[PDB]
Design a protein around this ligand. Sequence first.
Ligand SMILES: [Mg+2]
Ligand SMILES: [Zn+2]
Length: 1181
Amino acid sequence: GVESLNVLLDNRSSHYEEIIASCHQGINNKLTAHEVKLQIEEEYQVFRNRLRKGEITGQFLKVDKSRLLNDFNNLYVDEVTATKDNIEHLIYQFKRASPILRFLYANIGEGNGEERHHTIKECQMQYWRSFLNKVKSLKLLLIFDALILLASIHDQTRHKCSKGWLGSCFISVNDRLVSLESTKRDLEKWVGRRQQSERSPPDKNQILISMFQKTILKATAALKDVGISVEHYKINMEVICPDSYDLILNFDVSGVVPTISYQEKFPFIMGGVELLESTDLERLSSLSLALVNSMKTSSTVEAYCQEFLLSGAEFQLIYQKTGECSKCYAINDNRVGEICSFYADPKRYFPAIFSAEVLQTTVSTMISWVKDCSELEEQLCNINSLTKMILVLILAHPSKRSQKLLQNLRYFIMAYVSDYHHKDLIDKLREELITDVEFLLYRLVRALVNLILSEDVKSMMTNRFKFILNISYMCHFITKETPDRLTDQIKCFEKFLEPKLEFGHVSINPADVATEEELDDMVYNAKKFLSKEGCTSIKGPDYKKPGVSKRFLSLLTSSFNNGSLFKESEVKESPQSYSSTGPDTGRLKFSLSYKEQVGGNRELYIGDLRTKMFTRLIEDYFEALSLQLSGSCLNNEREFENAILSMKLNVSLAHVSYSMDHSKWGPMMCPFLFLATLQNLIFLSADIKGRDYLSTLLTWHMHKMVEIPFNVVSAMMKSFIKAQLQSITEDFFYSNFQIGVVPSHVSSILDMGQGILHNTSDFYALISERFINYAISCICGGTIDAYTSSDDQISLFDQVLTELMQRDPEEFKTLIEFHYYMSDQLNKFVSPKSVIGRFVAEFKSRFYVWGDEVPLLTKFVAAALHNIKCKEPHQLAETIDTIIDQSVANGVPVHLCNLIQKRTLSLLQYARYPIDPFLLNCETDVRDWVDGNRSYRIMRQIERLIPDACGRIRSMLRKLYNKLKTGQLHEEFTTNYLSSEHLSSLSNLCELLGVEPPSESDLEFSWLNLAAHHPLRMVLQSSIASGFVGLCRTLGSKCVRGPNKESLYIKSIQSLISDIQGIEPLIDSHGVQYWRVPLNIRDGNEGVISYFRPLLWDYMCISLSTAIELGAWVLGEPKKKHNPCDYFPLKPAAIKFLDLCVALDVNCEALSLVSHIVKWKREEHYIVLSSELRLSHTRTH
Ligand SMILES: [Mg+2]
Ligand SMILES: [Zn+2]
C-alpha cells in the first residue's frame, strides 16, 4: 500500500527543496576507511588534553561505601532531627501514630463471654431485614420500619439480646439510621388521620394489623411468581401481636449517641497486641471489606451504617454520603460511641480482604533467606519486627509518595555493589514528603538498611542483596490508579510544554493552510538543530541540549557506507492532491493522554484512522530494515536468549558490565533527524521512488499538530478570571489571554510521538551504538558488545579492558569520559542511574549474579492479589491459573500458591456461587506445573474426589489407547459413541473389550451445570473495587437463561432440588460440591434434571484428550538442613489425530483444550527448588 501514493497529484512547491538542501549542506558521506581514524584520534587527543587540565567536568565517581551510607542517612536532614534511632522507641510510637493504627493494636473487647457465643445464632430481626430488603428490590417505608421494630421487640422479650441498635437509633432497611420517637409520632398521626377519614366502629389496634396482613399478602403473592418459596427465609409469623399499636407506642430505649468529628480521647489501651502473631491482619481485612462494601448504597432519590464483628464483639462503621469518592468515616460501638474518625478513600483497600495467611507466609519465607549468617544471629528478632511494620504500614496508608520512596531504593542498592557511578545520583533519590507517616516510613527503612548492610558483616552478600532488592518491590502492593484526575492532566501538559520553550519554537495556530512565517520558522529551526559544536571551540561541549553535529553525522554516514560496521556474514472522502505539508484534506492531528504506571506517568498520543493507516508504512519499512541486521531485541525472540546467555557467561567469568538507561528519549528525538540520516545512505549500489515516498511521509510527520486538552484550558481560564479581578506554563496562557485569542493547538520541530515511531528509533540506536563501539575499539585495544531495546542497553567488556581497569585506572576513566561525550554528541543522553561493575548485570528488569538467582517474589504475589474482574466465573480461574503457572517457573514455592488459590476460592464463595470441581485444584505440587498442564491438574482433582471408581476406567482407557495407536478401530468409535447417550454407552464400550464394565453404583455421581441451555448474562469498570461490587451484584439478579425463553434465579433452582427427597449433596474439605443422583428418579422428572452431568464421562473424555496431547504416562498408576537457596533447572516433557481432537472437544462443555494453544504461550524452561523435587508423584508408562 506504500506505492498507492502514485495515484495522487503532485503539488510540491519550492518549500520541499530547502529542507533537502539543508540536510545536504555540509555533510560528507563519501569518506574512506582510512580518513576517519585520523579524525577520531585528533578528537581523542584534544579531548584528553583538555580534560587533564580541568576545563571539562568528570560526571563519574568511584564507589565508596562509607560515603554512600553517610549520604543516604541524612538525606532529609531538615525535618528529621535525629541521626540514629532506637528500635524500642520506634515500636513504641508505631502503635500510636494514627486512628487506624490505634484501632489495630488496642485492647478491644477485653471480656469475651456468652455475649460472644450468642453472635452465631440468628435472631428474627435479621430474617425480617433480609426479607424486606429482597422485597424492596422489585406509606411504604413506614410499614417496613414498624415490622422491623416489632421483630426487634419480640426478639428482646424472649432471651434478652440487643444486636441491631446504636444508642436510641436502629438500622432498619437500606442501611438507614432512622430515629425511634419520630416513627412513633408518625404512626400515631397516620393511624389517627386514617381513622378520621374512614369514620365519616374499629379501633387503632386493628387497622395496623389489617395493613400488615394486606402488605404481607401482596408481598408473598409477588414473590411466589418468580419461583422462590417462603420456607427459605425461616421467618416466624408470631412477631405480630393482637395489641401492636399500644405495644409500639410505649417502648423505651436509652444509650450513647453516635457522632462524626469533621476536624487522649481513645477509650482503650494502646499497645496490647504483639507483632509476632497474626491478630492485626485479620482486623485490617474486616475493616477493608467494610470500606469496600460501603459503595453499594443507592442514591435514595441522613446516616448510613455497616457492621462487622472482630472477636465476637460488634462494631459499626457510619458515614454520611453515598457514591464513590473520599468521605469521612466514624467507628462506633454500642457500649461507647465515637471510637475514632478518619478520612479514607473507599477504593485502594482491595488487596487485603481475605489474604491474611499469604502475607504472613511471605514475610516468613523472606526472612528465612538471611538465617545462616553469624554476624546477624543476635539481632535477628528486630528484622522481623521491621519487615512486618513496613508491610502493615504500606497496606494501611496507601499513598502515592510512599510508592516512589520505596521504588527509589533499587538504584541505591544497585550502586552500592558497583565500581563507578554517576555523580548526580543522590539528588535523584529525593522525593517531596508531606504527612507525618511518610517520615516514619523513611525512618523504618533507614533503620533496616543500616542494620542489614553493616560494616562488620562480610559472610553472604548474595542473600542480603536479594533481601534488600525484595523490600524495594513492595510498592507494587499499593495501586496504579490515580488519586486525582485533574492534576495529572496538568502535569502531563507541563511535561509536554517545558522543553519546547527553551529551544525557542512554538506555533500557536497552524490554520491548516500554512503562511510564510511558519515555513520560514521551520527552515530556520531545521538549520539551528544541526549547528552543535564541541571540544574544538572556546567554551566546549554544552551538555544536555538537543542537536547533532555535522562532523559526527559525516563520520557515521561514511562508516556505514564503507562497510566497517558489518559483521563477517553480513557482507555476503479520498484526497487527490498532496503538498509538502500534508494531503489535500488537512494535516495530521493528534490528541494527548496519559497512562498509569507504578511510580510516575507516561504520555500517550492518539490519532484518527487515516494517520494510523499512513504510519504503518514507515513502521513496516524500518522494522524490515532492522530485521535485515542483527543485534536488536525489541521484536526479535532469539536475540533475547542470546543476550541472556552472554550475560550469564560474562557474570560467570567476572568481567566488567555496563548497565545503561537513556533519559528524555521521546521528547528529544525528531523526524528531521531520521530524514537527514536516511538521505545520506547508499543501500544497493524504482527504489529511489520508494525513498521519495518515505521522505514525503516523514515531511508530513514533521508538520503535525497536537490538540490541547479541555479541562486544562477551562481551569486556566477560571484561574485567570479569578486572580485578575504562576510558572512558565502559566505565563503562556496568561499572555495569550491578555491579548484575546486562546491556545488550542501546538506545533513544533522538537518532538516525536511517544510510542508512535518506535522501530525507526530502534534502528537509529542500533547503528549509532555500532559506530560508537567501533570508535572505542579503534582507540584502545579492546572490544565491546551491545544489545538495545530502543531505550535500554547492556554492554559486556573483554579481558583487555578488565585488566586495564586495575592496571591503569586513569586511562579507564578517560575512556568512560570519551564514551559519554561521544554519545552526547549524537543526541543520546546517559541517565544518572547507569552503573559499571563486576558483581551484577541487568537488562529489561532481569538480574543475574554468580552463585544464586534473583527471583522477584513480592512482585508476583502483588500481581496475583488484585487481578479480578467482572467476568464469567469460569474465565477468572484460567487467568489465575496462568499467572500462578508463570510465577512458579521463577522460584516461588508451591505452598505459597496454594494459599492464593484458596484466597480466590474464598472470594468466590463470599458472593454465593456454587463451586464445581472444574475451577481450581489447591493441592498441587511441582510435577503438576513442570510436566503437566491444566487438564492434568483437573484430572488429579477428580481422582482425589472419587477413588475406587477411576481404576477400571483407567484400565479400559489403557486398552483403548493400545488399540487405537495402530488403527484397529478409528471409525467404529468416533461415530456411534460421541453422538449417543452418555450413560448407556460406557457399559457396552467396556464390554467390547475384555474388561469388567463400570458398576451401577458408580454412575450416580453427577455435578450441577448452570448455563446448560445458554450462557449466563453478565452485561446488562475503571477500578477493581467496582469490578468486585458489580460481580457481587450481577450474580443474584437473574444471571440465568431458561429452556424456552425466560430468566431465573440461583435460589429457585436449589429450592427445586431440595423439593426432591432422592438426591444427595457431598462437600469435600476445601468446599467442592458433587451430587449423587439415582437412575430411577432420573426419569419422570424432566424439568430440573436437565442441568446435571455425569462425572465419569467427562473424566474419560478429558483423560483421553490429555493422553493424546501429552505422552502416554498419564494413563499409568500414581504412587507416592535443606537450605532455602538450592535451585535446579528443568525442562518440560516434549493430520490423523486432529480430527479426533476437534471431535472430542465440542462434546464436553467443561474446558477448551484447543484455545490454550491460540491465546496462550508455553513456558520455555523452569527453575525450581531442589528440596521440593524430592516429595512428588511419579507416573510410569
Ligand atoms: Mg537498563
Ligand atoms: Zn438473640
